[PDB]
Amino acid sequence: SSSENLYFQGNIFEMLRIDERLRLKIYKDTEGYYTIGIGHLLTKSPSLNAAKSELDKAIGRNCNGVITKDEAEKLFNQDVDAAVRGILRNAKLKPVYDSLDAVRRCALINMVFQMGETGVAGFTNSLRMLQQKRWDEAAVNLAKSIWYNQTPNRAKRVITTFRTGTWDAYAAEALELLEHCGVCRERLRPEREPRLLPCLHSACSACLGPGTVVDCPVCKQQCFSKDIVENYFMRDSGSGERTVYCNVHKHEPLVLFCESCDTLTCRDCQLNAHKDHQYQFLEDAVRNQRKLLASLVKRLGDKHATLQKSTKEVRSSIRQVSDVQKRVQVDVKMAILQIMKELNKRGRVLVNDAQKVTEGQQERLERQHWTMTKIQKHQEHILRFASWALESDNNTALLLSKKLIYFQLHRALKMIVDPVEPHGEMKFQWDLNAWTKSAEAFGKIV
Amino acid sequence: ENLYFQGNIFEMLRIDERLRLKIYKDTEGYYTIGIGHLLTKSPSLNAAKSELDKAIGRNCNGVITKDEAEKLFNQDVDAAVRGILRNAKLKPVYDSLDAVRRCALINMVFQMGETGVAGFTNSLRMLQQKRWDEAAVNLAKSIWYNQTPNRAKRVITTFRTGTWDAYAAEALELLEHCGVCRERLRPEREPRLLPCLHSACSACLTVVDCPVCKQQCFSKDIVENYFMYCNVHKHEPLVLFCESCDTLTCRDCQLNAHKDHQYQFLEDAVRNQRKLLASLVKRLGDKHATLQKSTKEVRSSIRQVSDVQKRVQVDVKMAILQIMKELNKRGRVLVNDAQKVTEGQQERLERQHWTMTKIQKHQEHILRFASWALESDNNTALLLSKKLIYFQLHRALKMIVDPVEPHGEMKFQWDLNAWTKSAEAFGKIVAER
Amino acid sequence: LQFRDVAIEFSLEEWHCLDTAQRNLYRNVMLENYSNLVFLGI
Amino acid sequence: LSELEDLKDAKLQTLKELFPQRSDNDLLKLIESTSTMDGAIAAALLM
Amino acid sequence: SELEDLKDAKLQTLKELFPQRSDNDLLKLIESTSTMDGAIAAALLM
Ligand SMILES: [Zn+2]
Ligand SMILES: [Zn+2]
Ligand SMILES: [Zn+2]
Ligand SMILES: [Zn+2]
Ligand SMILES: [Zn+2]
Ligand SMILES: [Zn+2]
Ligand SMILES: [Zn+2]
Ligand SMILES: [Zn+2]
């Protein structure tokens, strides 16, 4: 990409490894808090032992003040995961995070990792600017903060990432770090006796442990200690280029490059120890050596570009298989809902079939109950009256109206009431087991 | 003795609430219409009319029909029952009561509202504990009772006993009152008896329709309700039965108008007619007794037919829910099968991403170091570092990165037409005689 | 037999995979399953 | 004999009680056009 | 050497992925698998 000599594995974990040096012993940060590993806070109260206790607790081990790198890495991944969840559950950070590209999302996670979701939610005007792009403007507003004044070097890197959406600030620091000890980050001045391991990581001689073998503190790749050489580029950083002298002929400078052995030699070794194999004088050999190496770099950069494309293809495949799963979950649920719909349609039909029968019989029985009730009312009216008329001592009135009463008594006695006719019954019938087994064995999943 | 009634809530309320087809003010000055239907407590008659129009669905200048009144009546009766059921203090009581006493509770709520009745805390408690005589005495002290005592006494007697005797007794009493205005039929009302043994103030009446029954008679057939003396001679009693003309007559009319037709003395006509009527009444009472039982049967058949319909609706709905449960049981399995496949594919893809990422980190480490070494002016350091740098450059160039595999897609498969046809043919309703 | 047994729910990720007819079909059934359970009482 | 005239009368009086504002003419027609009492009543209910 | 160079390429790839496994264990995984991805998956299991 923008590769003057700028390369960067652009993700949140690599981003944070640059911002936070690994400390396998409890240390006090610049606000006096006890922290360990990769930017992990143990305790805020300035306790002598709360820090050790929280260390033992977080690890699950009796940690006097020391964890292993594996333990540090476990804490680190947990802490990154925590920062991300904090963004997602936070009403102010989440909509911003969603709007951002992956580079800028990492810049936002970085802030949360360092300060907490509440502190980052506090940068309201900056968060708004970012959700609206306004990248240059967000960069300026963020540089006005306390964060910036307290940790300007990190803030400048994070702000550049928000502004440009590139990883250049981190590629640049990764490059700067070639000149610093892989372990303690001290600049590799000659006083540090800088050493270059075969895996091209380098360190203060004091930062390496145990012919014999040494495990690289960066990347863990093992080598023989006899194969560790001086980091001659940094060894000379305190003076400029120095003649190097033979390990054996200690007064003779190395002035020849032995192509057959691919290393520098002094005159006495080239004439004696290395007799009959090929060499040039140093300043003659160097031009072709620079061309060979630069050519390999061109080839490796091409392979790198291919791998970057291949990795992007893999991420897309990942999103695809995830989406196939969602497709299947939806297809399954919709298939069942579709069946449920037809079952409810049949349900309504079965009920309407039963209702057709019931309405017929009820129309009849209700008609008859209506008849019986209304005839009964007449009967009670006549009986109530006829008894009242006879309860009366007024024989004149009784005889004067006997005609009207007599008629209604006979009329009620002629009333026709057809008898209560019986009714059929009906029952719902179905095969529970056949349907259960058609469920259970419904479909697949090809 | 001669107590007949048709014991249900609707006939109960008809005894207690005279039908009104025009808006009127009740005893609290509230506007009411129909069968005890309160329109509004608002003092504005126009508010009453607006509520009436709202209730009926048309512009009623304060007037409704009997059918409209009946519709409100049934709505209000149903409303009283819902009020009882949704109320924590009334439902336990109602549930504990028999059908007759339940009608008494509905009667009260119909009249006063569920919260008014709920206010009768101790009387309600007594009723649920079946302390009937205590409940009667306590309810009899209420504002209700003092405000509508005859109604309250009928409702209270209904609570005391399990019967409708109070309502049978009021129906008997009502024979002495006008069929439409319910005023007592004293002679000043010119009370008249129609051939269908309904009576009315002459004021409320060749041909006339009965206010109560809707049945016709010739006005010539309508007589004074004589239960509440000669129509020709102003000082004469009727003392003879003109058997020839089937009517009572006085001395002067039998002597002149009906000279020597044929007659019996009133005392002769009295004893005989009372023996005849008494037997017709016993016969009708027996026909009535039979009809009461045949009606209990039709009611049982109606409930049974209804219960069968509910049974089928339940069996169908439950049968379907049970199948639905099994479909979702399967749905969960189908998804889980798919998820196993997805997890497998994602395990691979992430392994491959991890590999490519880690190899890339190496490539960038070597590219960065070698480039830095070449920017340097320190040719001695470069030549001393050449063996190590070259080695890592070639080693990075050899590294093997397998390409991503095509990983095929999985699909959900099922037979939609087969399932629609199985559902269309699902279940059967079987009839038996 | 309570509602969960016949209920179907869509996640947000799934919800946005549903078109108009699918969202309505879902309503038809879920509304109707509810009514059948209200009637039945469980 | 005149049994059907006594039956017709009994059926008519039953209908007049059930349908108080129908003419005897309409009520007799539906009695004559049906077979049972319930039949006649059902016919009368259709107005 | 036709396939020996490929075996060494696979070895160096594994060594970068699993820095503290011996060359003999990594070669055994290469011998027992058919692909690079296979050897890696088996290595992650160990
Ligand atoms: Zn290393
Ligand atoms: Zn160091
Ligand atoms: Zn040599
Ligand atoms: Zn030498
Ligand atoms: Zn009157
Ligand atoms: Zn009448
Ligand atoms: Zn006279
Ligand atoms: Zn006479």
Numbering used by the authors:
A (entry chain B): 16 to 225, 243 to 478
B (entry chain A): 19 to 223, 244 to 266, 277 to 481
C (entry chain D): 4 to 45
D (entry chain S): 1 to 47
E (entry chain C): 2 to 47
Authors' description from the paper:
At its target DNA loci, KAP1 functions as a recruitment platform for repressive chromatin‐modifying enzymes including histone H3K9 methyltransferase SETDB1, heterochromatin protein HP1, and the nucleosome remodeling and deacetylase (NuRD) complex (Schultz et al, 2001, 2002). Here, we report the crystal structure of the KAP1 tripartite motif (TRIM) in complex with the KRAB domain from a human KRAB‐ZFP, ZNF93.
The crystal quality was improved by deleting the flexible B‐box 1 domain of KAP1 and adding the CUE1 domain from the chromatin remodeler SMARCAD1, which binds to the coiled‐coil domain of KAP1 (Ding et al, 2018; Lim et al, 2019), to the complex. The resulting crystals allowed collection of X‐ray diffraction data extending to 2.8 Å resolution. Contacts with KAP1 are exclusively mediated by the KRAB‐A box (residues 3–44 of ZNF93), while the KRAB‐B box (residues 45–71) is disordered and not visible in the electron density map. Our structure of ZNF93 KRAB bound to KAP1 reveals that the interaction is mostly hydrophobic in nature, with a buried surface area of 1,108 Å2.
